[PDB]
């Protein structure tokens, strides 16, 4: 069968594939609910409405609710997961300095800092150990997962 470490590898390209969304959720997604409800929109359109794709990567998609959190759906048979062992989550965060919110409810209070990721497998020790809460679960099996979503 295929090489965990080979599957791991193929999992964190995914994980690229997401960071013009980080990348688009800071400069145009999160001075408002109406700025992250647009770039919600704007995102999501892209690669005939799956956000982003590649041999390894079926969807990179927003939650349609613009929740801003981001869930990338891993092509199994290219990568080597279960047949419904195959996504990641990454859940948003605002940093003002002292404590973290989840976007959506720092946008709409107009909390002003920075943007923190949490990234989640079948488990979620990494995300959970750097502080973070409140993040749904992905299905990639933790053995299969880069260290970060674990």
């Known amino acids: 069968g295929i ?9 964190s390209e ?16 999160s001075a408002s609910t109406a700025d ?16 982003a794709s590649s041999k ?15 869930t990338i759906t891993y092509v199994a048979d290219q990568v080597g997961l279960p047949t419904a062992g195959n996504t990641l989550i990454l859940s948003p965060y605002i940093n003002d300095g002292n404590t973290r919110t ?3 409810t720092a946008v709409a209070a107009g909390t ?3 943007i923190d990721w949490a990234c989640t497998s079948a488990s979620n020790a990494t995300a959970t150990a750097q502080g973070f809460t409140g993040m749904a679960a992905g299905s990639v099996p933790q053995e299969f997962a880069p260290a970060q979503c674990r």
């Open 3 to 11: 090489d965990p470490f080979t599957v791991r590898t193929r999992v």
């Open 14 to 29: 995914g994980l690229v594939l997401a960071e013009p969304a980080k990348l688009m959720i800071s400069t145009d997604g």
């Open 36 to 51: 992250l409800t647009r770039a919600t929109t704007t995102w999501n359109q892209q690669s005939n409405n799956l956000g």
């Open 56 to 70: 390894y990567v079926t969807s990179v998609l927003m939650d349609a609710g613009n929740t801003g959190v981001i």
């Open 102 to 104: 989840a976007l959506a």
């Open 112 to 114: 002003r800092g920075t």
